[PDB]
Amino acid sequence: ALLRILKETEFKKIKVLGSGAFGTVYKGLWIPEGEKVKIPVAIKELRNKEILDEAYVMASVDNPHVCRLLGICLTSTVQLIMQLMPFGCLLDYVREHKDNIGSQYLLNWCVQIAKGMNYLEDRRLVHRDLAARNVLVKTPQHVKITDFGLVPIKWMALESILHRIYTHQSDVWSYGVTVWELMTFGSKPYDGIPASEISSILEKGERLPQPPICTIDVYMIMRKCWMIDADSRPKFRELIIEFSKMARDPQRYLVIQGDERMHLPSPTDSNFYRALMDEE
């Protein structure tokens, strides 16, 4: 219904964008038959036709902060088509802007990721791979969650490392690590520590260090996501409220040098961005 079955003669892979746990992402072109136009798309080639049933679920998501699977091609290697995000993922974005971000942008991203994760919770889809690399930037003012519903030890809750149980509260943990990535401008969590040892350091009660720009107010939220008791860590609905609260007074909760001249887009610039690449 909302998933278009494509045939191989309708799209072309052009450039490789990256590789992850399961799949390689290409920049591609959609070639509508009978037409002379070439529309850019993102294609994930993976590494059971029932997969069609899985595809229908991701084609059925409806939220401004959740990516939708647009099409699939099954003739050979399973290929999936979704809208291409020219800004790439949020992780690469925040690294390349380590010097010019701003508290207003950072806190709003936390709101948007929480909104998307709450939507997935309402639909009872567990992400199982939330991380800054799986948050796509449509525009700098608008981020979207991807590759949900399907090796990454440093984002997994303790109950996911020891036992293989992924819950919405396990997603809350990975949400906490995702915020940490943003607040550290794309730092690698537990840098230098082998993944084999992360299981053990968490039971000793060691967490990720406090980001230098974070007040304790925001750091308490992050740490609250990493509590060993899954049912005691925050709910996504609460995260929306807290971060939305902080976004109404951003300089009070994030201490960034020069935070006054690198703030939210002007309405003229917002209208220009929106008419050009974000009309939803």
Ligand X SMILES: Nc1ncnc2c1ncn2[C@@H]1O[C@H](COP(=O)(O)OP(=O)(O)NP(=O)(O)O)[C@@H](O)[C@H]1O
Ligand Y SMILES: O=C(Nc1nccs1)[C@@H](c1cc(F)ccc1O)N1Cc2ccccc2C1=O
Among 6, 73, 80, 137, binds ligand Y (CB under 6 A): 80
Residue whose Cβ sits closest to Mg ion: 147
Instruction: Supply the Cα-derived Rg of the chain in whole angstroms.
Output: 19
- For residues 2 and 55, what is the distance between their CA atoms, to the nearest angstrom? 10
82 binds ligand Y (CB under 6 A): yes
Q: Which of 12, 87, 210, 224 binds a second copy (CB under 8 A)?
A: 87
136 binding ligand X? (CB under 6 A): yes
Asked if 20 is part of the footprint of ligand X (rule: CB under 6 A), the reply reads yes
Which 8-27 positions form the footprint of ligand Y (CB under 6 A)?
A: 23, 25
Q: Decide if residue 272 touches a second copy (CB under 8 A).
A: yes
Annotated catalytic residue within 53, 92, 99, 129 = 129
Q: What is the C-alpha to C-alpha distance for residues 69 and 192, in angstroms, rounded to an integer?
A: 35
Token code pair at residue 195:
């993944």
Contact window for a second copy (CB under 8 A) among 67-75, 141-149, 220-228, 235-243: 67-75
Residue 104 is a binding residue for Mg ion (CB under 5 A): no
CA-closest candidate to residue 239, choices 67, 65, 118, 66: 118
Only one of the segments 64-72, 206-214, 230-238, 243-251 lies at the binding site for ligand Y (rule: CB under 6 A); that segment is 64-72
Cβ contact 278:123 at 8 Å: no
Q: How far apart are CA 67 and CA 135, in angstroms?
A: 9
Q: Hey, what's the torsion of the CAs at 206, 209, 215, 220, to 10 degrees?
A: -20
Asked whether position 147 contacts Mg ion by CB under 5 A, the answer is yes
How many whole angstroms from its chain centre is CA 19?
16
Torsion, Cα 26 32 37 39, to 10 degrees, reads -30
Q: Which is nearer to a second copy, 68 or 154 (CB)?
A: 68
- Name which of 149 and 259 has its Cβ closer to ligand X: 149
Residue with tokens 């293989």: 164
Interior/surface letters 2-37, b for 16+ CB within 10 angstroms, e for the rest: ebeebeeebbeeeeebeebeebbbbbbbbeeeeeee
Residue 89 in the binding site for ligand X (CB under 6 A): yes
Per CB under 6 A, the segment of 51-59, 77-85, 169-177, 204-212 that binds ligand X is 77-85
List the helix and strand counts (H, then E) for the chain. Answer: 10, 8
Quick check: is 231 catalytic? no
State phi, psi for 256 to the nearest 5 degrees. Answer: -120, 130
Q: Binders of ligand Y: how many residues, by CB under 6 A?
A: 19
Q: Which of 79, 118, 134, 141 binds Mg ion (CB under 5 A)?
A: 134
Select the residue whose beta carbon is closest to ligand X and give its number.
20
- Nearer to a second copy by C-beta: 140 or 152? 140
Among 6, 42, 110, 156, binds ligand X (CB under 6 A): 42
Q: Find out whether 59 and 2 touch, Cβ atoms under 8 Å.
A: yes
Kindly list the catalytic residues: 129
Q: Interface residues with ligand Y (CB under 6 A)?
A: 23, 25, 42-44, 51, 54-55, 58, 67-69, 80, 82, 146-150
Q: Interface residues with Mg ion (CB under 5 A)?
A: 20, 134, 147
